Design a protein around this nucleic acid. Structure first.
Lengths: 224, 155, 142, 158, 226
RNA sequence: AUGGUGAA
RNA sequence: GUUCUUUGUAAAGUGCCUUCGAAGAGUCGAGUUGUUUAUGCAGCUCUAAGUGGGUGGUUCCAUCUAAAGCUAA
RNA sequence: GUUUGACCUCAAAUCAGGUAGGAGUACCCGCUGAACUCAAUAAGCGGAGGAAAAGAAACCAACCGGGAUUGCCUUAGUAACGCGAGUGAAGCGGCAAAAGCUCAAAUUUGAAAUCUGGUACCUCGGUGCCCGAGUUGUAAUUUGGAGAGGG
């Protein structure tokens, strides 16, 4: 076992990126050496180093000038982690019950400096697919109208996901950085989960969607 | 003690005129490797499926910059102060003065090169330009070449 | 030791250039050294090993199918917008719950009742509960 | 070219500018180690006319030798000893002091693929040229050997 | 201390803005009188009329740091859109039509959508009232049921309908809404933010352009951008 | 003399 | 010999007309001190020229272009 | 705008791609170098190859010119020296073999056109992409036999 600081020094990766790595993988007690050794072999470290080098080269270009170089410099998904933490699709569905609460909360958050508009747009669009799928297989079994929101319980192959729908009222705004990493991981999981569910439903994916109806209500009344 | 021929640098162009010179030079930045390569690829694609005015760019290479000098082709010469081999640039101001060509000194060779893509350029010059070049030359003259014409003195 | 220099030579300006080198045609010709590279690229495109720039843009385009249980939190406990009248606890208990030390606090909600649906208030503590659960979602010793 | 002027400037070493430059650089050289890498040659004209080029694979060294064997050859041998994998093609003077003399030496890497891949310098990669300074085959070595041009028992079967 | 260039640039920009405002006002005064005999144009058109139409307006930054001009500053104060990235819904009318040109350089206008209006109302909202400095968000409809609802606007959906359907309580609700402070685009600085801002700025020139012509058609852009 | 060997 | 390629306003040579048109510096050299088979080298103060300079013998003539480098026999 | 990045320099790597030690030593290349003028001999030191080294004249020549370097005969036991013991060559002449040449040196400026490294294909390497070296100079064009621009 090694200390958290010792493990960070061995990985020589700043705590900000170590938080993301631990969230993707999961390490806790002081910490067992084997977990740190396994993490060090992950390919995500190479991608993080590449991103840091890209950022520093972009800063070099911006300081030197010639913005064309910075624009030209602009030229990933944690698929492997999904398999490790979710050995099988039922395991992913089981973990959904607590994972997707963060995504559903983010689906109604307002855009701010701490959260880019793209993140909120993706979160809202993910709901447009989740509700669309749930409205075709008719797996809804509970509709508890709680103060926190309407506590939905869709019987997703017998795991009774306890996802909660936040109210449409403005959710006035903690360290969102960790929340941002959790949202990114859950969105990466949701992409594959939705792909699998749509393939199982027999509908061609991605199916067509209607935007004029979206401009009227913007919600489940679209995307067939 | 530095001889009178040395210390001609370090006393350089003022802040505002230096910034104006940098802005003017940025208007004629030479095409970079990526831009040149993409332009050549586009030209090849156009020709391979289905004659331009002479280009303009800043002069930076010491050998060809000096070659333009003496021939009176250099309209303006910009020199760095922090160059490690001083002998490379000690004679350049004297040659420019003898040939009757405007010249100026700047602090920071890397900043000199940042406007010409290369990491460092030591010296730079311009061959062609639109009309602000004359005003910049007059300002540089009145602020360095005529106000500090006594560079031959002091130690 | 300390004397000024003499500008005996740097006082007159030459008229004619020091050299009368003949003018090369290349200066008056569109960069034949660049037409060479243009034709090399043309040859490479003809051989097909170089993709035209348009195809690069036109080609900028799948189902992939210490590990203790996370211990999910308990389900809802009479936090409905229209709960039984008996479950609407007195203000004194609600005040104690609100003033209860955090973390050690047991209940995660305050009892309330609302008849009209439009009167249902929006939850303001949703973000805080999710943030609290986030810590356990990855810092839990398990 | 600038070299045309640099050569003439270096010719008048007694001039004030070069006298100041030498006394400025002597202290910096002294503060450095006995043998140290030089990022760029302080006399680019001399190195370029000596066949040195700025392309990859070329290395410039500097070394200090006590004053009072030929100093150039001793400096070349000393730099070659530390730089076992490099070849001391040539060396030239840059600065002199009352107690020490400074000679710049240009090194060419034979293992580097860039040096091996060009016909203008691939000859130096042959094993025959190994330790060229050791045998005094350089310009200073040949001069010391007295290889000038001009005046400057056997029994057969029958 | 401030360098000379800034003062000269501000003066030059202010002169042009004042000249444009004066020309537009003088032309509009003659157009209203209906003489329409020795002016560039008398009719009005929009390209991408003064008929009723609910439109959304966003206060954009720029142009260069022109000192607050009386006409445009007062017009903005009427809509209380002084702060950048602030927007409010206004009822288009013939009398209000010249205001677009009066404050065209500082704002961008367009036709919103029902979904966009609903999302904006349900995601943002202010009620600056009971010391009453609190910026309480539209958490519950109780405030709407008490302070509002005299005309039947009891819930947020009623406010949405009034705004989209131009109801009688449109003026009352709009003032009560304390128009929203929309978040800025980049909302950052540092290594990536600088490049992102530089890239975004290019679209501003091609989208937020002012022809400065007295008879320039009303500038309109789809509100779907944000 | 050259180059090594050892000892109180 | 056999072949698939031969290419792009691509490269070279030669005679005619015309205009331009470089050369290895603490280096040659010089004095001294040590070595050398009265050449050369080395330490050191000085250290320069480009219709210039190095080696020679007759009244100043013959040859060459040094202080960088590769090269089987 | 007290924040920042560049450039220059100084360090670190169980990082990637590379190399020197040692041995043999007849021959070869330099330093040092002892005694019966002995001897620029022997020993010692350092470095290499199958040969090493030298090599295409700031050479010899006083001719009706020869014309890279090295070996043999001859020059010659002569010139020259110490005239004394001993040392001691070289041009020319004949023989075996012959080969040329490359950069600094003058603007590629209408395009650093140059190259190392990493990656995906067919592999004593070639192609696309990315980075880096490069302007304090990487390719072609010129090395005194001159050479360059043009018609």
């Amino acid at each position: 076992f090694i200390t958290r600081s010792q493990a960070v020094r061995k990985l020589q990766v700043s705590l900000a990126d170590f938080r993301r790595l631990c969230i993707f993988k999961g390490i806790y007690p002081f910490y067992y050496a084997k977990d740190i050794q396994y993490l060090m072999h992950e390919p995500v470290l190479a991608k993080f180093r590449e991103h840091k080098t890209f950022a520093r080269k972009l800063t070099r270009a911006l300081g030197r000038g010639e913005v064309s170089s910075a624009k030209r410099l602009e030229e990933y998904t944690l698929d492997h982690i999904i398999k490790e933490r979710y050995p099988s699709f039922p395991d992913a569905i089981r973990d959904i019950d607590d994972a997707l609460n963060m995504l559903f909360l983010f689906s109604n958050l307002p855009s701010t400096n701490q959260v880019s508009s793209k993140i909120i747009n993706d979160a809202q669009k993910i709901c447009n697919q989740w509700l669309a799928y749930v409205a075709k297989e008719r797996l809804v079994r509970k509709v508890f109208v709680s103060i926190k929101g309407v506590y939905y319980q869709a019987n997703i192959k017998g795991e009774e996901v306890r996802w909660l729908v936040p109210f449409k009222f403005p959710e006035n705004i903690v360290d969102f950085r960790i929340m941002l990493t959790f949202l990114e991981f859950y969105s990466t999981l949701l992409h594959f989960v939705l792909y699998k569910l749509y393939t199982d439903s027999g509908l061609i994916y991605p199916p067509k969607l209607d935007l004029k109806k979206d401009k009227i209500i913007s919600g489940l009344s679209s995307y067939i | 003690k530095v001889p009178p021929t040395i210390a001609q640098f370090q006393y350089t162009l003022d802040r505002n005129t230096a910034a104006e010179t940098f802005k003017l030079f940025n208007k004629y930045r030479p095409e970079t490797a990526a831009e040149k390569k993409e332009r050549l690829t586009k030209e090849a694609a156009a020709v391979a499926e289905g004659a331009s005015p002479k280009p303009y760019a800043v002069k930076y290479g010491l050998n060809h910059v000096v070659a333009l000098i003496e021939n009176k082709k250099a309209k303006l010469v910009l020199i760095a102060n922090d160059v490690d081999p001083i002998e490379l640039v000690v004679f350049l101001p004297a040659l420019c003065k003898k040939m009757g060509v405007p010249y100026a000194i700047v602090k920071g060779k890397a900043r000199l090169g940042t406007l010409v893509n290369q990491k460092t350029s030591a010296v730079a010059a311009l061959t062609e330009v639109e009309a602000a070049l004359a005003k910049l030359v007059s300002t540089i003259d009145a602020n360095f070449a005529d106000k500090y014409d006594e560079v031959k003195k002091h130690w | 030791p300390y004397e000024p220099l003499i500008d005996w030579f740097t006082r007159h300006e030459e008229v004619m250039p020091l050299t009368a080198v003949p003018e090369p045609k290349r200066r008056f010709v569109p960069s034949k050294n660049e037409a060479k590279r243009v034709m090399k690229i043309v040859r490479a495109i003809r051989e097909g090993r170089i993709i035209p720039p348009k195809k690069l843009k036109e080609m900028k385009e799948y189902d992939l199918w210490h590990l203790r249980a996370p211990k999910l939190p308990p389900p809802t406990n009479e936090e409905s917008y229209n709960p039984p009248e008996e479950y609407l606890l007195s203000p004194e208990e609600k005040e104690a719950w609100e003033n209860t030390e955090y973390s050690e606090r047991e209940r995660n909600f305050i009892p309330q009742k609302y008849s009209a649906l439009r009167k249902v208030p929006g939850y303001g503590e949703s973000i805080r509960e999710r943030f609290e659960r986030s810590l356990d979602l990855y810092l839990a010793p398990r | 070219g600038a070299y045309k002027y640099l050569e003439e400037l270096q010719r008048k070493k007694q001039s004030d500018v070069l006298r100041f430059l030498q006394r400025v650089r002597v202290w910096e050289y002294r503060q450095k180690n006995v043998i140290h890498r030089a990022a760029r040659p302080t006399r680019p004209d001399k190195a370029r006319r000596l066949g040195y080029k700025a392309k990859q694979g070329f290395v410039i060294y500097r070394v200090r030798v006590r004053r009072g064997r030929s100093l150039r050859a001793t400096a070349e041998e000393r730099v070659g000893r530390r730089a076992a994998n490099l070849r001391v093609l040539n060396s030239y003077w840059v600065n002199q002091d009352s107690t020490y003399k400074y000679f710049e030496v240009i090194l060419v890497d034979p293992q580097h693929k860039a040096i091996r891949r060009d016909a203008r310098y691939n000859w130096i990669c042959d094993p025959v040229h190994k330790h060229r300074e050791a045998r005094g085959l350089t310009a200073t070595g040949k001069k010391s050997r007295g290889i000038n041009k001009g005046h400057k028992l056997s029994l057969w079967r029958y | 201390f401030v360098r000379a260039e800034s003062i000269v640039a501000k003066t030059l920009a202010t002169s042009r803005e004042k000249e444009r405002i004066k020309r537009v006002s003088i032309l509009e005064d003659k157009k209203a009188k209906n003489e329409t005999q020795h002016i560039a144009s008398g009719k009005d058109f929009i390209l991408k009329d003064g008929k009723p139409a609910l439109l959304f307006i966003v206060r954009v930054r720029g142009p260069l740091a022109v000192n607050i001009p009386n006409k445009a500053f007062k017009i903005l104060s009427l809509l209380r859109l002084v702060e950048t990235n602030t927007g409010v819904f206004v009822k288009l009318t013939k009398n209000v039509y010249p205001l677009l040109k009066v404050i065209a350089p500082y704002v961008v206008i367009g036709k919103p959508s029902l979904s966009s209006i609903r999302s904006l109302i349900q995601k943002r909202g202010r009620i600056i009232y009971k010391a009453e400095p609190h910026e309480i968000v539209l958490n519950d409809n109780n405030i709407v049921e008490e302070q509002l609802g005299d005309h039947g606007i009891i819930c947020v959906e009623d406010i949405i309908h009034e705004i989209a359907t131009m109801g009688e309580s449109f003026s009352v609700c709009n003032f009560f809404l304390q128009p929203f402070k929309l978040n800025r685009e980049v909302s950052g600085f540092g290594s990536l933010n600088r490049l992102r801002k530089i890239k975004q700025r290019e679209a501003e020139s091609r989208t937020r352009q002012f022809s400065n012509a007295a008879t320039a058609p009303v500038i309109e852009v789809d509100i779907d951008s944000l």
